[PDB]
Amino acid sequence: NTLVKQLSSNFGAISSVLNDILSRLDPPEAEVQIDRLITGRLQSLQTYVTQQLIRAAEIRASANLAATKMSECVLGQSKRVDFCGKGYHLMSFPQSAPHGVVFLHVTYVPAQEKNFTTAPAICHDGKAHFPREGVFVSNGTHWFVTQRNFYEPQIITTDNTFVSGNCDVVIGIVNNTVYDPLQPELD
Amino acid sequence: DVNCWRVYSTGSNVFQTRAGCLIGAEHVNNSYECDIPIGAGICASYQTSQSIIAYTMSLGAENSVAYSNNSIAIPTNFTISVTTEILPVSMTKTSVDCTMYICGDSTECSNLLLQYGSFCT
Amino acid sequence: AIPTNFTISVTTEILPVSMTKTSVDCTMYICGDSTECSNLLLQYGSFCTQLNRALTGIAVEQDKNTQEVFAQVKQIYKTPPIKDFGGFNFSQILPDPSKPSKRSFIEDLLFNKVTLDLICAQKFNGLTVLPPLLTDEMIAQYTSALLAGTITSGWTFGAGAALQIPFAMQMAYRFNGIGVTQNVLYENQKLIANQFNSAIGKIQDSLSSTASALGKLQDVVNQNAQALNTLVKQLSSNFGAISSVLNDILSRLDPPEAEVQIDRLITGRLQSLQTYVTQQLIRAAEIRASANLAATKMSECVLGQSKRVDFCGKGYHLMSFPQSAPHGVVFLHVTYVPAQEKNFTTAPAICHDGKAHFPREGVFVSNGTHWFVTQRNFYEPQIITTDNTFVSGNCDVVIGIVNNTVYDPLQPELD
Ligand SMILES: *[C@@H]1O[C@H](CO)[C@@H](O[C@@H]2O[C@H](CO)[C@@H](O)[C@H](O)[C@H]2NC(C)=O)[C@H](O)[C@H]1NC(C)=O
Ligand SMILES: *[C@@H]1O[C@H](CO)[C@@H](O[C@@H]2O[C@H](CO)[C@@H](O)[C@H](O)[C@H]2NC(C)=O)[C@H](O)[C@H]1NC(C)=O
Ligand SMILES: *[C@@H]1O[C@H](CO)[C@@H](O[C@@H]2O[C@H](CO)[C@@H](O)[C@H](O)[C@H]2NC(C)=O)[C@H](O)[C@H]1NC(C)=O
Ligand SMILES: *[C@@H]1O[C@H](CO)[C@@H](O[C@@H]2O[C@H](CO)[C@@H](O)[C@H](O)[C@H]2NC(C)=O)[C@H](O)[C@H]1NC(C)=O
Ligand SMILES: *[C@@H]1O[C@H](CO)[C@@H](O[C@@H]2O[C@H](CO)[C@@H](O)[C@H](O)[C@H]2NC(C)=O)[C@H](O)[C@H]1NC(C)=O
Ligand SMILES: *[C@@H]1O[C@H](CO)[C@@H](O[C@@H]2O[C@H](CO)[C@@H](O)[C@H](O)[C@H]2NC(C)=O)[C@H](O)[C@H]1NC(C)=O
Ligand SMILES: *[C@@H]1O[C@H](CO)[C@@H](O[C@@H]2O[C@H](CO)[C@@H](O)[C@H](O)[C@H]2NC(C)=O)[C@H](O)[C@H]1NC(C)=O
Numbered sequence: 001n002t003l004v005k006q007l008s009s010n011f012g013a014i015s016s017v018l019n020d021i022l023s024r025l026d027p028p029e030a031e032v033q034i035d036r037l038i039t040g041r042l043q044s045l046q047t048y049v050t051q052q053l054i055r056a057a058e059i060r061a062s063a064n065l066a067a068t069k070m071s072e073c074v075l076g077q078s079k080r081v082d083f084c085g086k087g088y089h090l091m092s093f094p095q096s097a098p099h100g101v102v103f104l105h106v107t108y109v110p111a112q113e114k115n116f117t118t119a120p121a122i123c124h125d126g127k128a129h130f131p132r133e134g135v136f137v138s139n140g141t142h143w144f145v146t147q148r149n150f151y152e153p154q155i156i157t158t159d160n161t162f163v164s165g166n167c168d169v170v171i172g173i174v175n176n177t178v179y180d181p182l183q184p185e186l187d
Numbered sequence: 188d189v190n191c192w193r194v195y196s197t198g199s200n201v202f203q204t205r206a207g208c209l210i211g212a213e214h215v216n217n218s219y220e221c222d223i224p225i226g227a228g229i230c231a232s233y234q235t236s237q238s239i240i241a242y243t244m245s246l247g248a249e250n251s252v253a254y255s256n257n258s259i260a261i262p263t264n265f266t267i268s269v270t271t272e273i274l275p276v277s278m279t280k281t282s283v284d285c286t287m288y289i290c291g292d293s294t295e296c297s298n299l300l301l302q303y304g305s306f307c308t
Numbered sequence: 309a310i311p312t313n314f315t316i317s318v319t320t321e322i323l324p325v326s327m328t329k330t331s332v333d334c335t336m337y338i339c340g341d342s343t344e345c346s347n348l349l350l351q352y353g354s355f356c357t358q359l360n361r362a363l364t365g366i367a368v369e370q371d372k373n374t375q376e377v378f379a380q381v382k383q384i385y386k387t388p389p390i391k392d393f394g395g396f397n398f399s400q401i402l403p404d405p406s407k408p409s410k411r412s413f414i415e416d417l418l419f420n421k422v423t424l425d426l427i428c429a430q431k432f433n434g435l436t437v438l439p440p441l442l443t444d445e446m447i448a449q450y451t452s453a454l455l456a457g458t459i460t461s462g463w464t465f466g467a468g469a470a471l472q473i474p475f476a477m478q479m480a481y482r483f484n485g486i487g488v489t490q491n492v493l494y495e496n497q498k499l500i501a502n503q504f505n506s507a508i509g510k511i512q513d514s515l516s517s518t519a520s521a522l523g524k525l526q527d528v529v530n531q532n533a534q535a536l537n538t539l540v541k542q543l544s545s546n547f548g549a550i551s552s553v554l555n556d557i558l559s560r561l562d563p564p565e566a567e568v569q570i571d572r573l574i575t576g577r578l579q580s581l582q583t584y585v586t587q588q589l590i591r592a593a594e595i596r597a598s599a600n601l602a603a604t605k606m607s608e609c610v611l612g613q614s615k616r617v618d619f620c621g622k623g624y625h626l627m628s629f630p631q632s633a634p635h636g637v638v639f640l641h642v643t644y645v646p647a648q649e650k651n652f653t654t655a656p657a658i659c660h661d662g663k664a665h666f667p668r669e670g671v672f673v674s675n676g677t678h679w680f681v682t683q684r685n686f687y688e689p690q691i692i693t694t695d696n697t698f699v700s701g702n703c704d705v706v707i708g709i710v711n712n713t714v715y716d717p718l719q720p721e722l723d
């Protein structure tokens with residue numbers, strides 16, 4: 001709109017209508033007037049073209065980002081944090097909009113939480129026990145092992161841990177028992 | 188860039204900030220979230236009386252996690268959420284014309300423009 | 309080749325986030341203070357109204373870049389008075405409540421190492437500088453909140469609620485994600501703590517001995533000043549007229565003859581202003597791209613652990629900490645690197661009872677008389693049993709299989 005409205009400026013000439021100039025003057029004294037209008041209009045065209053060229057690069061960069069998001073968040077599962085919405089990512093759905101794209105990210109978010117007391121390792125018979133997968137927890141009277149992102153207590157067994165070295169080298173080890181499920185079946 | 192002194196239409200409720208002298212906006216001492224920016228950590232919004240409120244931005248609530256050396260927190264329940272994002276992909280395609288714009292339908296103007304080089308190809 | 313020892317390193321990264329916000333004013337710049345000059349300018353339709361609408365568009369983005377990079381926490385976390393982090397020592401980067409501008413020591417060194425009337429010179433010509441929306445105290449608070457999040461909540465606080473966990477177990481989890489089992493960490497607690505403390509101590513000495521890396525953060529500022537100076541100096545050229553003084557031309561010639569000199573001066577000054585604004589527009593894009601890259605690094609390397617190689621430091625990434633610097637950000641990456649390698653002879657598989665055994669984890673090695681299986685990134689021999697391998701077919705198709713014996717612990721127990 002600004003570019004099209006620029007056509008009305010006198011640019012230091014008699015009138016902004018070219019037919020008025022070439023209906024009132026003889027060409028030897030009309031060319032010098034027409035030159036100013038030509039110069040001004042050419043400058044305005046240059047400015048508009050430069051602005052469009054500048055904006056195109058930004059739009060192309062945004063388009064490339066959208067392409068990467070489409071390739072990663074949709075055609076698969078991405079473990080990059082905050083690249084497919086807040087929280088952990090599960091899936092995405094694309095939608096089309098006039099001159100744009102809309103992404104629907106589905107995310108999984110942990111809701112509640114509880115207090116617990118934990119220890120890094122367990123010493124049973126002079127050997128330190130470590131959790132194969134998960135973490136040790138204890139509600140003050142018993143000890144269980146549970147997965148990281150959910151509450152699901154289980155009994156400590158030799159099929160759920162692994163041994164390494166001897167205790168008294170770990171900073172905060174605590175002592176307890178281990179089930180060893182094979183023993184009752186042996187008898 | 189004036190300091191409160193020189194005014195031309197002043198009533199009351201004159202306030203001084205780091206971004207200039209503010210006239211017409213009431214000043215309070217309770218923080219909120221920024222709605223209409225002003226600057227230098229000052230934001231203004233139209234909350235309740237019926238006047239304009241000017242205040243300092245609040246970054247949010249403050250909490251301190253009950254940290255320890257043998258205490259842990261485990262979730263017991265979860266939630267599914269859905270979020271939306273909007274991204275532009277293109278804009279309007281346009282095209283102009285050399286002679287139709289600069290010279291219109293005139294014939295002498297085109298010959299005069301030929302004096303210039305290739306400034307429109 | 310197998311490593312047998314490891315080293316913790318700390319690396320730094322510097323990124324510019326934003327630049328100073330300026331604004332012009334044509335009527336007091338091109339025309340100074342005159343009536344005829346403004347009347348002549350009125351013939352050019354809507355140039356300066358467009359220029360002032362573009363410069364404010366540039367300026368408004370500088371207050372959004374910092375918000376996109378730093379404001380990524382919905383709360384404000386506070387470090388506890390308890391300072392038993394298993395041996396680690398964050399005293400150099402935690403906020404110090406001893407000065408009114410509460411900042412950490414390294415932030416103070418960063419501020420002192422960057423050195424910024426010019427404003428009155430602009431006021432001669434209507435040029436002005438606008439202050440940023442977020443004051444430096446707010447940025448310091450944001451950085452303190454982000455740093456306190458990772459100390460006492462691991463990386464859970466960035467994806468929901470904040471859950472506390474002792475620092476030792478968090479570091480053990482972080483090693484678990486780079487291919488080293490947990491039992492290494494608890495057997496080297498003091499050794500890791502001392503190395504981390506010494507690495508942190510080295511950084512301040514490096515920055516206190518005239519570091520040449522901060523120049524990248526400095527350079528941009530210099531450039532702006534340079535360009536701005538050029539603009540003012542442009543006013544001291546006659547552009548082919550009699551003189552560059554506006555009032556002198558009106559004071560020594562008739563108006564119908566002075567109008568042409570006025571027009572020449574107007575054209576020259578307008579062209580100079582256009583060139584300056586185009587330069588500003590060009591530079592804004594580079595700064596914005598750098599800001600977006602910094603935001604991506606902040607979201608990935610800090611609020612979590614990234615398995616991308618050479619994106620959060622050189623080596624296997626462990627964590628990172630942010631620091632605020634004048635118009636920029638500084639990242640401290642903590643990294644794990646193997647140290648001393650030893651030779652071994654390997655073999656793909658083992659077949660014992662006519663069936664090939666493949667290792668369920670790690671790799672088969674042998675010192676020359678006996679065979680062990682060990683995890684890939686650290687030397688730790690174990691006896692080959694049926695809890696470490698799995699069977700697949702008969703040994704006739706593997707290229708380099710070799711005889712050996714598998715323990716099978718159940719049989720001694722049942723005996
Ligand atoms: C901690 O949780 C355990 C697991 O349920 C509780 O132990 C059980 O308690 C019930 C009754 O409270 C008994 O009937 C079970 O026999 C117990 N199981 C075992 C393996 O002993 C324990 O009571 C909880 N402690 C606290 C303080 O809440
Ligand atoms: C956990 O319990 C074991 C016993 O099963 C403790 O081992 C003994 O502890 C006593 C006193 O703490 C020592 O005098 C003995 O020398 C230890 N060894 C034995 C009896 O073989 C172990 O110390 C306990 N760990 C704790 C309390 O952290
Ligand atoms: C803004 O205006 C106030 C109002 O005068 C200034 O306060 C004066 O400061 C000067 C020098 O500091 C003193 O000599 C006057 O006595 C002060 N007068 C009053 C009424 O306070 C204030 O200094 C100005 N702002 C700045 C940055 O100079
Ligand atoms: C886990 O959270 C869900 C949703 O917050 C709980 O499901 C709700 O349970 C209540 C029972 O008190 C019902 O009245 C609601 O209708 C349930 N919600 C829905 C969407 O069906 C669920 O009970 C929670 N689980 C536990 C163990 O607390
Ligand atoms: C792994 O490297 C560390 C140092 O990088 C070794 O610890 C050093 O051990 C020597 C003993 O010869 C001491 O004099 C040094 O003071 C120790 N360094 C530190 C920082 O305490 C460690 O021994 C190496 N591990 C192995 C198995 O060689
Ligand atoms: C953690 O690091 C700080 C920083 O070096 C230690 O504080 C230093 O303590 C020594 C004596 O122990 C003093 O000579 C230094 O002047 C202190 N420096 C500072 C900056 O305060 C601190 O001792 C370390 N350990 C703990 C537990 O904080
Ligand atoms: C390769 O490693 C094995 C396992 O440790 C070494 O065998 C041990 O050697 C020592 C010293 O000769 C004996 O005390 C042990 O009884 C041996 N154990 C077994 C299971 O054989 C062997 O010596 C090592 N070979 C070389 C060349 O270093």
Ligand SMILES: *[C@@H]1O[C@H](CO)[C@@H](O[C@@H]2O[C@H](CO)[C@@H](O)[C@H](O)[C@H]2NC(C)=O)[C@H](O)[C@H]1NC(C)=O
Nearest residue numbers: 657658659660662703704707708709710711712
């Ligand atoms: C595993 O050991 C056997 C030896 O028992 C190696 O080859 C066999 O050798 C015996 C006599 O020495 C022959 O009767 C068998 O026919 C051989 N087996 C085959 C498949 O030809 C066998 O090469 C060893 N595997 C290795 C070295 O990878």
Ligand SMILES: *[C@@H]1O[C@H](CO)[C@@H](O)[C@H](O)[C@H]1NC(C)=O
Nearest residue numbers: 113114115116252253258260
């Ligand atoms: C866990 O215990 C601490 C101990 O003071 C307490 O501050 C915190 O609120 C507790 N957490 C919950 C979820 O109640």
Ligand SMILES: *[C@@H]1O[C@H](CO)[C@@H](O)[C@H](O)[C@H]1NC(C)=O
Nearest residue numbers: 171172173255256257392394
């Ligand atoms: C944890 O801190 C308490 C102090 O409240 C201390 O008595 C205990 O020994 C500490 N435990 C570890 C493993 O550092």
Ligand SMILES: *[C@@H]1O[C@H](CO)[C@@H](O)[C@H](O)[C@H]1NC(C)=O
Nearest residue numbers: 213214215216217218242243
């Ligand atoms: C705001 O400033 C006034 C002026 O001193 C003061 O009386 C008032 O207590 C302040 N507001 C609050 C909430 O303290």
Ligand SMILES: *[C@@H]1O[C@H](CO)[C@@H](O)[C@H](O)[C@H]1NC(C)=O
Nearest residue numbers: 309310311648649650651652
């Ligand atoms: C492994 O053996 C090769 C050849 O004997 C030798 O060049 C190399 O230095 C050895 N590795 C180490 C760590 O010494």
Ligand SMILES: *[C@@H]1O[C@H](CO)[C@@H](O)[C@H](O)[C@H]1NC(C)=O
Nearest residue numbers: 654655656706707708709710
């Ligand atoms: C390994 O190379 C040696 C000679 O370099 C050769 O004798 C042997 O058969 C090769 N083994 C395998 C499994 O390629």
